[PDB]
């Protein structure tokens with residue numbers, strides 16, 4: 629009763645709902661993400677792999693006490709690791725681990741912490757890959773954190789999404805197999821849909 633509302637910051641419950649929301653959002657794009665998948669092999673599963681990663685994070689959030697930020701961060705990291713499938717799922721789970729690490733010790737997610745979490749998430753994903761390649765989900769995730777600017781949550785999500793979409797468009801310029809197939813990177817495209825889902829929850 630005595631805890632007011634933060635206009636541009638998410639409490640632990642809102643952070644959990646945001647990832648549940650983005651998981652429900654993601655399902656419409658799975659078939660497209662599968663068909664984009666050419667790197668490292670064209671086996672049509674990037675969307676399915678990333679969705680299984682997000683759904684496992686959602687199941688853990690449903691089991692956790694989402695009134696404590698540290699509990700939301702634990703479920704996000706632990707759930708995405710177990711559900712991770714394929715290269716995109718493992719990388720995504722490690723991005724989410726760095727995201728969750730930024731939330732630890734904090735009581736609310738504002739624009740400043742969202743920028744920090746997106747940047748730490750990208751660093752965590754880059755450190756976890758043994759041999760990173762550019763033009764990929766790592767390039768897109770790094771750009772989203774670097775371009776995340778502003779103090780209000782809506783502006784940070786908007787600028788991060790715009791930076792991610794710009795990096796996504798340039799992935800064929802960096803990775804020849806994408807150019808030859810005439811596609812953008814499926815993993816990077818999946819991360820854009822994740823950021824889009826987060827913007828949809830905040831809007």
Ligand SMILES: Nc1ncnc2c1ncn2[C@@H]1O[C@H](COP(=O)(O)OP(=O)(O)O)[C@@H](O)[C@H]1O
Pocket residue numbers: 665667668669671673674677678713714715716717719757759760761762764765766813814815816
């Ligand atoms: N070494 C790497 N560096 C950066 N990103 C990578 C690397 N390997 C794979 N990826 C990402 O994984 C995506 C493919 O994921 P997915 O289809 O699940 O992989 P697979 O089916 O080969 O296990 C790629 O589009 C790319 O974004």
Ligand SMILES: [Mg+2]
Pocket residue numbers: 665667668669670671672673674714
């Ligand atoms: Mg694949």
Ligand SMILES: [Mg+2]
Pocket residue numbers: 671673714
């Ligand atoms: Mg595969």
